């Protein structure tokens with residue numbers, strides 16, 4: 001529904017610490 | 020520019036993002052405007068007309 005959104009990646013402060 | 024033209028150098032900014040700023044300034048989250056943008060635009064146009 002958002003107009004003008006671009007594709008990117010966000011960071012997770014739990015995935016690298018758990019893995 | 021929004022409100023920066025009255026407090027210093029003018030800064031360019033898209034008008035939907037300025038509307039999101041003004042909506043977040045009163046407590047309403049920016050998602051309702053970023054999602055229902057067409058409805059707000061149509062309501063504003065109808066009010067101006």
Ligand SMILES: *[C@@H]1O[C@H](CO)[C@@H](O)[C@H](O)[C@H]1NC(C)=O
Pocket residue numbers: 003004
């Ligand atoms: C910006 O506006 C132009 C003119 O309508 C349009 O062609 C373009 O797709 C828009 N880009 C974004 C960031 O939505």
Ligand SMILES: *[C@@H]1O[C@H](CO)[C@@H](O)[C@H](O)[C@H]1NC(C)=O
Pocket residue numbers: 005006007
């Ligand atoms: C964003 O991702 C979707 C799904 O992969 C794709 O269909 C779309 O074209 C992509 N748009 C951009 C901004 O590259």
